[PDB]
Structure formats: structure tokens, C-alpha cells
Coordinates of all heavy atoms in Angstrom, one line a residue:
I61 N 144.4 -69.0 10.0 CA 143.4 -68.2 9.3 C 142.1 -68.9 9.3 O 141.0 -68.3 9.4 CB 143.9 -67.8 7.9 CG1 145.1 -66.9 8.0 CG2 142.8 -67.0 7.1 CD1 145.8 -66.6 6.7
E62 N 142.1 -70.3 9.2 CA 140.8 -71.0 9.3 C 140.2 -70.8 10.7 O 139.0 -70.8 10.9 CB 141.0 -72.5 9.0 CG 141.1 -72.8 7.5 CD 141.1 -74.3 7.3 OE1 141.2 -75.1 8.2 OE2 141.0 -74.7 6.1
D63 N 141.1 -70.8 11.8 CA 140.6 -70.5 13.1 C 140.0 -69.1 13.3 O 139.0 -69.0 14.0 CB 141.7 -70.7 14.1 CG 142.1 -72.1 14.3 OD1 141.3 -73.0 14.1 OD2 143.3 -72.4 14.6
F64 N 140.6 -68.1 12.6 CA 140.0 -66.8 12.6 C 138.6 -66.8 11.9 O 137.7 -66.1 12.3 CB 140.9 -65.8 12.0 CG 141.9 -65.3 12.9 CD1 143.0 -64.6 12.5 CD2 141.7 -65.4 14.3 CE1 143.9 -64.1 13.4 CE2 142.7 -64.9 15.2 CZ 143.8 -64.3 14.7
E65 N 138.5 -67.5 10.8 CA 137.2 -67.7 10.1 C 136.1 -68.3 11.1 O 135.0 -67.9 11.1 CB 137.3 -68.6 8.9 CG 137.8 -67.9 7.6 CD 137.7 -68.8 6.5 OE1 137.4 -70.0 6.6 OE2 137.8 -68.3 5.3
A66 N 136.6 -69.3 11.9 CA 135.7 -69.9 12.9 C 135.2 -68.8 13.9 O 133.9 -68.7 14.1 CB 136.4 -71.0 13.6
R67 N 136.1 -68.0 14.4 CA 135.6 -67.1 15.5 C 134.8 -65.9 14.9 O 134.0 -65.4 15.5 CB 136.8 -66.6 16.3 CG 137.9 -65.7 15.6 CD 137.5 -64.2 15.7 NE 137.0 -63.7 17.0 CZ 137.8 -63.3 18.0 NH1 139.1 -63.3 17.8 NH2 137.2 -63.0 19.1
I68 N 135.1 -65.6 13.6 CA 134.4 -64.5 13.0 C 132.9 -64.9 12.7 O 132.0 -64.2 13.0 CB 135.1 -64.0 11.7 CG1 136.3 -63.1 12.1 CG2 134.1 -63.2 10.8 CD1 137.1 -62.8 11.0
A69 N 132.8 -66.1 12.0 CA 131.4 -66.5 11.6 C 130.6 -66.9 12.8 O 129.4 -66.9 12.8 CB 131.5 -67.6 10.6
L70 N 131.2 -67.3 13.9 CA 130.5 -67.8 15.1 C 130.0 -66.7 16.0 O 129.0 -66.9 16.7 CB 131.3 -68.8 15.9 CG 130.7 -69.6 16.9 CD1 129.6 -70.3 16.2 CD2 131.7 -70.6 17.5
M71 N 130.6 -65.5 15.9 CA 130.4 -64.5 16.9 C 129.0 -63.9 17.2 O 128.7 -63.7 18.4 CB 131.4 -63.3 16.7 CG 131.7 -62.4 17.8 SD 132.7 -61.1 17.4 CE 131.6 -60.1 16.5
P72 N 128.2 -63.5 16.2 CA 127.0 -62.7 16.6 C 125.9 -63.5 17.4 O 125.2 -62.9 18.2 CB 126.4 -62.3 15.2 CG 127.5 -62.4 14.3 CD 128.3 -63.5 14.7
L73 N 125.9 -64.8 17.2 CA 125.0 -65.6 18.1 C 125.4 -65.5 19.6 O 124.6 -65.4 20.4 CB 125.1 -67.1 17.6 CG 124.2 -68.1 18.3 CD1 122.7 -67.7 18.1 CD2 124.5 -69.4 17.8
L74 N 126.7 -65.6 19.8 CA 127.2 -65.5 21.2 C 127.0 -64.1 21.7 O 126.8 -63.9 22.9 CB 128.7 -65.9 21.3 CG 129.0 -67.4 21.0 CD1 130.5 -67.6 21.0 CD2 128.4 -68.2 22.1
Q75 N 127.1 -63.1 20.8 CA 126.9 -61.7 21.2 C 125.4 -61.5 21.6 O 125.1 -60.8 22.6 CB 127.2 -60.8 20.1 CG 127.3 -59.3 20.5 CD 128.5 -59.0 21.4 OE1 129.6 -59.6 21.2 NE2 128.3 -58.2 22.4
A76 N 124.5 -62.1 20.9 CA 123.1 -62.0 21.2 C 122.8 -62.7 22.6 O 122.0 -62.2 23.4 CB 122.2 -62.7 20.1
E77 N 123.3 -63.9 22.8 CA 123.2 -64.6 24.1 C 123.7 -63.8 25.2 O 123.1 -63.8 26.3 CB 123.8 -66.0 24.0 CG 123.1 -67.0 23.1 CD 123.8 -68.3 23.1 OE1 124.8 -68.4 23.7 OE2 123.2 -69.2 22.5
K78 N 124.9 -63.1 25.0 CA 125.5 -62.3 26.0 C 124.6 -61.1 26.4 O 124.4 -60.9 27.6 CB 126.8 -61.8 25.6 CG 127.6 -61.0 26.6 CD 129.0 -60.6 26.0 CE 129.7 -59.8 27.0 NZ 131.1 -59.3 26.5
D79 N 124.0 -60.5 25.4 CA 123.1 -59.3 25.6 C 121.9 -59.7 26.4 O 121.5 -59.1 27.4 CB 122.7 -58.7 24.3 CG 123.9 -57.9 23.7 OD1 124.7 -57.4 24.5 OD2 123.9 -57.8 22.5
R80 N 121.3 -60.8 26.0 CA 120.0 -61.3 26.6 C 120.3 -61.7 28.1 O 119.5 -61.4 29.0 CB 119.4 -62.5 25.9 CG 118.7 -62.0 24.6 CD 117.8 -63.1 24.0 NE 118.7 -64.3 23.6 CZ 119.2 -64.4 22.4 NH1 119.1 -63.4 21.5 NH2 120.0 -65.4 22.1
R81 N 121.5 -62.3 28.3 CA 121.8 -62.8 29.7 C 122.1 -61.6 30.6 O 121.6 -61.6 31.8 CB 122.9 -63.8 29.7 CG 123.0 -64.6 30.9 CD 124.1 -65.7 30.8 NE 125.4 -65.1 30.8 CZ 126.3 -65.1 29.8 NH1 125.9 -65.7 28.7 NH2 127.5 -64.5 29.9
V82 N 122.8 -60.6 30.1 CA 123.1 -59.5 31.1 C 121.9 -58.6 31.3 O 121.7 -58.1 32.4 CB 124.3 -58.7 30.6 CG1 125.6 -59.6 30.5 CG2 124.1 -58.0 29.2
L83 N 121.0 -58.5 30.3 CA 119.8 -57.8 30.5 C 118.8 -58.5 31.4 O 118.1 -57.9 32.2 CB 119.1 -57.5 29.2 CG 119.3 -56.1 28.5 CD1 118.8 -55.0 29.4 CD2 120.8 -55.9 28.2
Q84 N 118.9 -59.9 31.4 CA 118.1 -60.7 32.3 C 118.5 -60.5 33.7 O 117.7 -60.3 34.6 CB 118.1 -62.1 31.8 CG 117.2 -63.1 32.6 CD 117.2 -64.4 32.0 OE1 117.9 -64.7 31.0 NE2 116.4 -65.3 32.5
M85 N 119.8 -60.6 33.9 CA 120.3 -60.4 35.3 C 120.1 -59.0 35.8 O 119.8 -58.8 37.0 CB 121.8 -60.7 35.5 CG 122.1 -62.1 35.9 SD 122.3 -63.3 34.5 CE 123.9 -62.8 34.0
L86 N 120.1 -58.0 34.9 CA 119.9 -56.6 35.4 C 118.4 -56.4 35.8 O 118.1 -55.8 36.8 CB 120.2 -55.6 34.3 CG 121.6 -54.9 34.4 CD1 121.5 -54.0 35.6 CD2 122.7 -55.8 34.5
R87 N 117.5 -57.0 35.0 CA 116.1 -56.8 35.4 C 115.7 -57.6 36.7 O 115.0 -57.1 37.5 CB 115.2 -57.3 34.3 CG 113.7 -57.1 34.5 CD 113.3 -55.6 34.4 NE 111.9 -55.4 34.6 CZ 111.4 -54.1 34.7 NH1 112.2 -53.1 34.8 NH2 110.1 -54.0 34.8
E88 N 116.3 -58.8 36.8 CA 116.2 -59.6 38.0 C 116.7 -58.9 39.2 O 116.1 -58.8 40.3 CB 116.9 -61.0 37.9 CG 116.1 -61.9 37.0 CD 116.9 -63.2 36.9 OE1 118.1 -63.3 37.3 OE2 116.4 -64.2 36.3
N89 N 117.9 -58.3 39.1 CA 118.6 -57.6 40.2 C 117.9 -56.3 40.6 O 117.9 -56.0 41.8 CB 120.1 -57.4 39.9 CG 120.9 -57.4 41.2 OD1 122.2 -57.5 41.1 ND2 120.3 -57.3 42.3
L90 N 117.3 -55.6 39.6 CA 116.5 -54.4 40.0 C 115.2 -54.8 40.7 O 114.8 -54.1 41.7 CB 116.2 -53.6 38.8 CG 117.1 -52.4 38.5 CD1 118.5 -52.8 38.1 CD2 116.5 -51.5 37.5
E91 N 114.6 -55.9 40.4 CA 113.4 -56.4 41.1 C 113.8 -56.9 42.5 O 113.1 -56.6 43.5 CB 112.7 -57.5 40.4 CG 111.3 -57.8 40.8 CD 111.3 -58.9 41.9 OE1 112.2 -59.8 41.9 OE2 110.3 -58.9 42.7
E92 N 115.0 -57.5 42.6 CA 115.6 -57.9 43.9 C 115.8 -56.7 44.8 O 115.5 -56.7 46.0 CB 116.8 -58.7 43.7 CG 116.7 -60.1 43.1 CD 118.0 -60.6 42.6 OE1 119.0 -59.9 42.6 OE2 118.0 -61.8 42.1
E93 N 116.4 -55.6 44.2 CA 116.6 -54.4 45.0 C 115.3 -53.7 45.4 O 115.2 -53.2 46.5 CB 117.5 -53.4 44.2 CG 118.9 -53.9 43.9 CD 119.7 -52.9 43.0 OE1 119.1 -51.9 42.6 OE2 120.9 -53.2 42.7
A94 N 114.3 -53.7 44.5 CA 113.0 -53.2 44.9 C 112.4 -53.9 46.0 O 111.6 -53.3 46.8 CB 112.1 -53.2 43.6
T95 N 112.6 -55.2 46.1 CA 112.2 -55.9 47.3 C 113.0 -55.5 48.6 O 112.5 -55.2 49.6 CB 112.2 -57.4 47.1 OG1 111.3 -57.8 46.1 CG2 111.8 -58.2 48.4
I96 N 114.3 -55.5 48.4 CA 115.2 -55.5 49.6 C 115.5 -54.1 50.2 O 116.0 -54.1 51.3 CB 116.5 -56.2 49.2 CG1 117.2 -56.8 50.3 CG2 117.5 -55.2 48.5 CD1 118.3 -57.8 49.9
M97 N 115.0 -53.0 49.6 CA 115.3 -51.7 50.1 C 114.1 -50.8 50.4 O 114.1 -49.6 50.2 CB 116.3 -51.0 49.2 CG 117.7 -51.5 49.0 SD 118.6 -51.2 50.5 CE 118.9 -49.5 50.4
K98 N 113.0 -51.4 50.8 CA 111.8 -50.7 51.0 C 111.7 -50.0 52.3 O 110.7 -49.5 52.7 CB 110.5 -51.5 50.7 CG 110.4 -52.7 51.7 CD 109.2 -53.5 51.4 CE 107.9 -52.7 51.8 NZ 107.8 -52.6 53.2
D99 N 112.8 -50.0 53.1 CA 112.8 -49.6 54.5 C 113.9 -48.5 54.7 O 114.7 -48.6 55.6 CB 113.0 -50.7 55.5 CG 111.8 -51.6 55.6 OD1 110.6 -51.0 55.4 OD2 111.9 -52.8 55.9
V100 N 114.0 -47.5 53.8 CA 115.0 -46.5 53.9 C 114.5 -45.2 53.3 O 113.7 -45.3 52.3 CB 116.3 -47.0 53.2 CG1 116.1 -47.3 51.7 CG2 117.5 -46.1 53.5
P101 N 114.8 -44.1 53.8 CA 114.5 -42.8 53.1 C 115.4 -42.7 51.8 O 116.5 -43.3 51.7 CB 114.8 -41.7 54.1 CG 115.7 -42.3 55.1 CD 115.3 -43.8 55.2
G102 N 115.0 -41.8 50.9 CA 115.6 -41.6 49.7 C 115.4 -42.9 48.8 O 114.3 -43.5 48.8
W103 N 116.4 -43.2 48.1 CA 116.5 -44.5 47.3 C 115.4 -44.7 46.3 O 114.4 -45.3 46.6 CB 116.6 -45.7 48.3 CG 116.9 -46.9 47.5 CD1 118.0 -47.3 46.9 CD2 115.9 -48.0 47.1 NE1 117.9 -48.4 46.2 CE2 116.7 -48.9 46.3 CE3 114.6 -48.2 47.4 CZ2 116.1 -50.0 45.8 CZ3 114.0 -49.3 46.8 CH2 114.7 -50.2 46.0
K104 N 115.5 -44.1 45.1 CA 114.8 -44.7 44.0 C 115.4 -46.1 43.6 O 116.5 -46.4 44.0 CB 114.7 -43.8 42.8 CG 113.9 -42.5 43.1 CD 112.5 -42.8 43.6 CE 111.7 -43.4 42.5 NZ 111.5 -42.5 41.3
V105 N 114.6 -46.9 42.9 CA 114.8 -48.3 42.8 C 115.9 -48.6 41.7 O 116.6 -49.6 41.9 CB 113.5 -49.1 42.5 CG1 112.5 -48.8 43.6 CG2 113.0 -48.7 41.1

């Protein structure tokens, strides 16, 4: 039960870091796609 207290009290900081990191990779990868696909019909970014 002390181990469960550890994981409960520790969690929201890791959740915030997870959200920031996946949003960072999504914005990076959309900019990468916007560079890499400018030579095709259709295709919004």
C-alpha cells in the first residue's frame, strides 16, 4: 500500500511530461510532413 501511495502521488507530473512530449513530436512531425510532401496533388498537411 505504501508503493501504491508512491505511484498515486507521483503520477500527474509524469502525465504532464507525457502530454508535452507527444504534442512536441506531433508538431515536429507535421512540420516534417509539410516539408516532405510538397510535390504531390491533393494532400493537405
Side-chain angles (χ1 to χ4, degrees):
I61 295 170
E62 284 187 352
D63 289 331
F64 276 165
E65 280 186 348
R67 66 89 44 88
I68 285 171
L70 192 56
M71 195 184 75
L73 182 63
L74 293 174
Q75 193 70 40
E77 291 180 354
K78 184 177 179 181
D79 288 331
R80 286 191 296 273
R81 197 177 68 246
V82 298
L83 266 297
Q84 186 174 2
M85 268 88 78
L86 260 295
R87 186 69 176 172
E88 286 178 351
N89 209 165
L90 264 70
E91 195 270 332
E92 292 164 354
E93 291 175 0
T95 299
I96 205 166
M97 291 289 289
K98 64 181 288 291
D99 288 331
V100 64
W103 189 70
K104 296 301 295 295
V105 302

